[PDB]
């Protein structure tokens, strides 16, 4: 209730370390993925994305981004395999995007920034609940998917059209029966490394799995994202753009590739 961090000039990523010292930690995210240095790991098991039974419930503008929330009271939508040991349950997805197509993603590929990045957040069921999971090194698994501007993503339109109803901070809307499988690219080839949440509290509890294949969304679709507001209703308009944290030092970590 007393957090004041954001993405503006005076409360942006370069200021976060004051209230959250872990911002300068040993396994912070996002990071630049240097494709020539990432090594193929033949030991990585196949990635398993089982979203057939996913049950979305609501979409919320939290003043930073918008979250599409799922019912995670049961083992429906889960992520397993890949670098993961155990079962991770989908709790929500959100995006990070820019003010222009040339920036917006958190992770970068050989320093290339994509227009946006989708994050599907999952928590390790061995810890019982999300709050307990974020206190563990292997508590979360976040699946990251890059977005580039070109052809429209049919599966994203239902999200785009509901944004008018959650323009400002604190607004939410019913959002049932949304199928996240419609946001995935064809290939599940990925890079993986141990990291953190990319907004405060910046906890170092995430196994990052970033897909190599980006999805394409249309200019009209991303333009709608850019019409959202960071501010609450009745306050001066601050367009919700550039809600991404820049790449952090890789330090003592190796990024592994699931493909050759
Ligand atoms: C506390 C928490 C709960 C949750 O369901 O999702 C989150 C997502 C993020 C993130 F958006 F910053 S990221 N990018 O690290 O996923 C940060 C914190 C949470
Ligand atoms: Zn995120």
Residue numbers in the entry: 1 to 125, 127 to 261
Quote from the publication.
Carbonic anhydrases (CAs; EC 4.2.1.1) are widespread metalloenzymes which catalyze the reversible hydration of carbon dioxide (CO2 + H2O ⇆ HCO3− +H+). The main structural features are represented by a central twisted β-sheet enclosed by helical regions and additional β-strands. The enzyme active site is positioned in a deep and large cavity, with the catalytic zinc ion placed on its bottom coordinated by three conserved histidine residues (His94, His96 and His119) and a water molecule/hydroxide ion which acts as nucleophile in the reversible hydration reaction of CO2 to bicarbonate ion. Here we report the crystallographic structures of hCA II in complex with two aliphatic sulfonamides incorporating coumarin rings, which showed a good inhibition and selectivity for this isoform.
The crystal structures of hCA II in complex with compounds 1 and 2 were determined to resolutions of 1.67 Å and 1.56 Å, respectively. As generally observed for other hCAIs containing the sulfonamide moiety, in both adducts the inhibitor binds to the enzyme active site coordinating the catalytic zinc ion through the ionized sulfonamide NH- group and forming further hydrogen bond interactions with Thr199 residue. Interestingly, even if the coumarin moiety is a well-known chemotype for CA inhibition, in the case of compounds 1 and 2, it does not adopt its typical suicide inhibition mechanism, due to the predominant effect of the sulfonamide moiety as zinc binding group (ZBG). Instead, in these compounds the coumarin ring contributes to the stabilization of the complex by means of numerous van der Waals interactions with the side chains of several residues delimiting the active site cavity. Interestingly, even if compounds 1 and 2 differ only by two atoms (two fluorine atoms instead of two hydrogens), their arrangement in the enzyme active site is significantly different. In particular, the two coumarin rings present a different orientation and the ZBG in compound 2 is shifted a little bit more deeply inside the catalytic cavity. Previously reported inhibition studies showed that compound 1 was an hCA II inhibitor three times more potent than compound 2, suggesting that its binding conformation was energetically favoured with respect to that adopted by the fluorine derivative. Thus, according to our calculations, we can hypothesize that the ZBG region of the fluorinated compound 2 assumes a different position with respect to the corresponding hydrogenated derivative 1 to avoid unfavourable steric and electrostatic interactions with Thr200 at the bottom of the active site.
